[PDB]
């Protein structure tokens, strides 16, 4: 948010800086140092399946997405622990043709046995936010059902 | 009949060397049969999930 004189928390004007406690206008913080760290992958309505292209960072560290509910707790997580850095993990939650393949170069690797079976509790994603575990970049395609349209 | 391979061809057509002839030559030089190999990993193969690269 933009910095405003009298409204923001700053010691300005006549030396050695002055910030006033007013009623309603008082002092409101401008923003946060390095606000570029905050990124929310927002989930507003219940989603069923998705086709994400996961770009992993570190090898041998569980890489994959986890899902947070409205209170900041985890219900489901698709997490894989690979031996080498995959160029991208392709995950599809579609019931009919599930795909969990780690691509490296032109080679496609099946990631099903390497996946955490206990963390992956449900396919149905609820209202909250998605967190990226050991990922540099992410590209998602969300499919959400509607009974009558 | 005798088939010559490791000899010069005066008109560049006399003794062409076929891949199977070199195959046999190489097997004989190294002392290998069809039930073994010669193998060298110049760089280490890499294991990723249920795959070997």
Swiss-Prot record, chain B:
Source organism, top-level taxon: Viruses
Subcellular location field: Virion
Domain topic, free-text comment: The C-terminus is involved in host receptor binding. Host-recognition domains point upwards, towards the capsid.
Subunit structure: Homotrimer; found as an assembly of 6 homotrimers. Interacts with host phosphopolysaccharides; this allows the virus to bind the external cell wall layer. Interacts with the distal tail protein.
Family classification: Belongs to the skunalikevirus receptor binding protein family.
Cited function: Binds to the host phosphopolysaccharides at the onset of infection. Upon activation by calcium, the receptor binding proteins change their conformation, presenting their binding sites to the host, and a channel opens at the bottom of the baseplate for DNA ejection.
Protein name: Receptor binding protein
Source organism (scientific name): Lactococcus phage p2 (Lactococcus lactis bacteriophage p2)
Residues shown, of full length: 2 to 54 of 264
